């Protein structure tokens, strides 16, 4: 669906940041309307390969920011922005788009030694794919230290002018419409570890009898950094530890898990057993895996802790037996990108969910049951969300569940276990009043 008309871009900045293993853009537009029926909408154009991997999309006004209604739809594909206070047909407006991606690039030497810097290859557009005509448009590539182009063009214009830790250029005037005329490829040094997980399932467990909430998380993380040539040698790793100071390099030795405020019973296990190299200091759960995760290596592990329920659960006002829970949507290391997240919250056995709200647009949601310990009846209410593309730093949200849990179903747990003990002992009575004596 192509937009007709009624927006023309006077100014158009485009600042790509490349500094923390996910690409973030901060577009800044100043638009002018044409003399027609005053329309109130906007269309932001993404490629078909970038629209598949996008995790956050927001808009500000530049005067003083409140928010705007930024909706992402579901072959250039679009994303709509809805304005309040419908605009007169000839007036300047100002606007800020922020967006956060999933891809970071390919290691341009894919094999590199562990004591050597890596360089990544990112591919993008240089002329901006706008759905409308632009009159002025500057590009700015902020980020790490060293930026270098890949197959530089013969034109002396459309060429990068390097600034102090920056790379500034762009086609600056009179770009008519959708412009896939040239695709940029830039290599750049990047000393972050590039942690990314493939499948995160995290199970929480509300409990009214214990008044506790119990977090358990299963991470399947890869390191998408550059692979290492000549294999792995413990001699070069151990000498690399013994030389100096462990600066910033590729592989993963420790992870810093940022937990909720008061967390009590910390554990960190692999598939084959538990791992004893973990340190649970106040508010921070540090983790050392068994082997250091170099470029391309896999590691699947499980962490878990226990919070009290008095700060995640809140009794409603109209009815005493109606509870409202707000769950942290994501806890993990500070530099991670999540390719799949499934958040399973487990309400107790007699709970009935009324209302569900999530701040991040999920891919899926369903309500099932699952039998845990002493679930003699149907079992826990498994409300499971499926989120696809998330960032650790960006997706700051809480999932809000409104349910009820009456005291008719609160005492059915000891009464159900009492029902099994009672029918077992009356079963003992039938098998002892019974005469079998030939």
């Amino acid at each position: 669906y192509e937009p007709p008309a009624t927006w023309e871009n006077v100014d158009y900045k485009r600042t790509i940041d490349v500094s923390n293993a996910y690409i973030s853009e901060t577009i800044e537009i100043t638009i002018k309307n044409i003399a027609s029926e005053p329309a109130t909408e906007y269309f932001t154009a993404f490629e078909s390969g970038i629209f598949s991997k996008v995790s956050f999309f927001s808009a500000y006004f530049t005067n003083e920011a409140t928010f705007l209604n930024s909706q992402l739809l579901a072959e250039i594909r679009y994303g709509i922005i809805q304005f309040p206070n419908a605009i007169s047909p000839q007036e300047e407006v100002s606007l800020v788009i922020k967006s956060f991606y999933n891809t970071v690039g390919i290691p341009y030497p894919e094999h590199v030694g562990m004591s050597e810097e890596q360089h990544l290859l990112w591919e993008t557009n240089r002329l901006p794919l706008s759905a409308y005509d632009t009159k002025k448009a500057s590009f700015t590539l902020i980020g790490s230290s060293s930026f270098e182009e890949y197959h530089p063009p013969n034109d002396e214009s459309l060429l990068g002018k390097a600034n102090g830790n920056s790379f500034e250029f762009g086609p600056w005037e009179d770009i008519p419409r959708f412009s896939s005329n040239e695709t940029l490829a830039i290599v750049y040094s990047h000393n972050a570890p590039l942690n990314q997980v493939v499948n995160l399932r995290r199970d929480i467990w509300l409990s009214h009898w214990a008044s506790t909430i119990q977090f358990e998380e299963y991470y399947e993380l890869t390191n998408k950094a550059a692979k290492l040539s000549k294999g792995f040698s413990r001699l070069e790793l151990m000498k690399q530890i013994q030389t100096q100071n462990m600066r910033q390099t590729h592989f993963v030795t420790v992870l810093d898990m940022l937990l909720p405020e008061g967390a009590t019973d910390h554990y960190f296990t692999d598939l084959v057993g538990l791992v004893s190299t973990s340190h649970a200091e106040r508010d921070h759960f540090f983790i050392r895996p068994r082997f250091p995760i170099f470029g391309g290596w896999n590691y699947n592990f499980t962490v878990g802790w226990t919070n009290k329920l008095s700060d995640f659960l809140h009794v409603s006002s109209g009815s005493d037996e109606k509870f409202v829970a707000s769950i942290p949507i994501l806890n993990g290391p500070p530099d991670t990108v999540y390719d799949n997240v499934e958040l399973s919250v487990f309400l107790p056995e007699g709970a009935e969910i009324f209302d569900i709200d999530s701040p991040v647009p999920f891919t899926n949601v369903s309500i099932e049951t699952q039998k845990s310990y002493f679930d003699l009846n149907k079992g826990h209410v498994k409300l499971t969300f499926s989120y696809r593309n998330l960032i650790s730093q960006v997706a700051n949200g809480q999932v809000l569940i409104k349910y009820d849990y009456p005291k008719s179903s609160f005492f059915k747990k000891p009464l159900s276990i009492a029902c099994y003990i009672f029918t077992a002992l009356m079963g003992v009575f039938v098998l002892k009043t019974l005469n079998m004596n030939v």
Partner: protein, 258 residues
Amino acid sequence: YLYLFVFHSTWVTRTAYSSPSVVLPSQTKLALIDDFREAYYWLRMNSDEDSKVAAWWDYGYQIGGMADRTTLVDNNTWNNTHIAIVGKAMASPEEKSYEILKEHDVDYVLVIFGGLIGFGGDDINKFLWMIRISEGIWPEEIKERDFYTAEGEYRVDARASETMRNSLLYKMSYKDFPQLFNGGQATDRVRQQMITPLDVPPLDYFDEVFTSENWMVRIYQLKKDDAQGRTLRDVGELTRSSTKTRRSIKRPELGLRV
């Protein structure tokens, strides 16, 4: 005596019969060692799920229990010949051990080495039990009275034999061990011998892919045979040490083409 029986029966249980067989607390300091789960979980995480791991037989269950990979020998010794295959492969030159470890579709070979921390149950002192059970099946290929120093000693340092130095498990276990400490000397803690980098001949058919933190469990890979058909020791002597920009042109004495 009934009350003394309880204190005896709990002291004996706590001291002598309550220890894990996986975590190895040798205290090289009350330090625990989990190099077996580190290496086996490297095989579980960083290998294709149909790779075949040829280790010695007394570690055969734990690999299949922890690495979830395919082995060749195993703890119950019901086929002794198939154990003499791996015992023949561990004690033979790597020219004749690559040939027998690719005929069986093996891509990973792991060894146990307790020379940096003093484990003693490594695969260099149960190495003679790899030559006894493979000498009775294949005599005059693998033979004892080799691996000895012509006076009856079982040495590991530069006093050792030539068949001991060119063996597969020797140069797989002691690879990069003299370059560990400094100065080109290395004090093996179990065998109490010092080795030098002019020992331990290089490995031209295998390459290491993992080695644990205390150097216990070494994991090696059969690197693929060369594309141009030449032998891998000729690739090894190609890529190094030869020959000071000096040449020779000669009738190559190769026979005749069929």
